Amino acid sequence: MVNAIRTPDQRFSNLDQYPFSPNYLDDLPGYPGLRAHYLDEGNSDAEDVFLCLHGEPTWSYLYRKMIPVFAESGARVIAPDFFGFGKSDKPVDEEDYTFEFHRNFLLALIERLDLRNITLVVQDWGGFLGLTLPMADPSRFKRLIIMNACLMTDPVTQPAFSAFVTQPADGFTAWKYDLVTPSDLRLDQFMKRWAPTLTEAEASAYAAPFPDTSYQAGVRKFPKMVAQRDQACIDISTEAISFWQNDWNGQTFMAIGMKDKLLGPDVMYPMKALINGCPEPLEIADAGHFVQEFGEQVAREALKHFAETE
Ligand SMILES: [Br-]
Ligand SMILES: [Br-]
Ligand SMILES: [Br-]
């Protein structure tokens, strides 16, 4: 149905520090012919599930330093790849990717796997999309670990979640330029620039899902959605603000990548205030937009905080 392609499996043969076995979900309600990849580590019968949602232009490989930590604590870890990323199938037409297309996939994934006692772990698009999930089925969500992200509401409702789109010139403006303009986009080069701490091998892992341009429709469409937010995205995100403010009563942990020119303190503090009960954020000085690359520390501290509140 949705015209899509699949990344040859050989592309993933030499990943660095990615020993997690593949699991797949074929023909999800509303996603016929599409195969979604996800990780399922730790005790399958654990009473706690850490739902790790990735962003642009990464995949579950991003959480590779956090997964082991949550699993060692006795919890189950679910890290899916959005359609267009990682090992999931990738629609060829940008016009197929929308806010609700990625959101409904997440909701369908949760129902199918009947996830409960969820500790929502988000960053970037993982959060733009993830933070809107709980209000649809609140009984399923227990905790939240928020890293550099926010809600795609309109400029009037929350100016802090729109201002970063235009300024600074070297922030989202630069980011989106690097993504949507190159005819021959090299994500390993992109990530080495936006995550200066990565090694050559680690950057290669981010290029792995895309042999060429035809596999990058999902990558190109993401920043265009941050710039142009449809009505559903605005309504859904606006309704999500009211949820975190008036309905949320779970444990929360926040971590900020201080060097992030896109979703740092400017967006994160307004966010912290919107989330009822959100404590004092952990500020990681050396971290940029991809906080998960400094994720072992985030993961460990989040567990300590969660335990001290048990
Ligand atoms: Br970095
Ligand atoms: Br690439
Ligand atoms: Br983006």
From Swiss-Prot:
Gene this chain is encoded by: dhlA
Family: Belongs to the haloalkane dehalogenase family. Type 1 subfamily.
EC class (word): hydrolase
Signal peptide: none
Pathway(s) served: Xenobiotic degradation; 1,2-dichloroethane degradation; glycolate from 1,2-dichloroethane: step 1/4
Active-site residues, as the UniProt record annotates them: 124, 260, 289
Domain of life: Bacteria
Organism of derivation: Xanthobacter autotrophicus
Protein's name in the database: Haloalkane dehalogenase
NCBIfam families noted in UniProt: PRK00870.1
SUPFAM superfamilies associated with the record: alpha/beta-Hydrolases
InterPro entries linked to this entry: AB_hydrolase_1, AB_hydrolase_fold, Epox_hydrolase-like, Haloalkane_dehalogenase, Haloalkane_dehalogenase_1
Entry keywords, A to Z: Detoxification, Hydrolase
Coiled coil residues, start to end: none
Temperature dependence: Optimum temperature is 37 degrees Celsius.
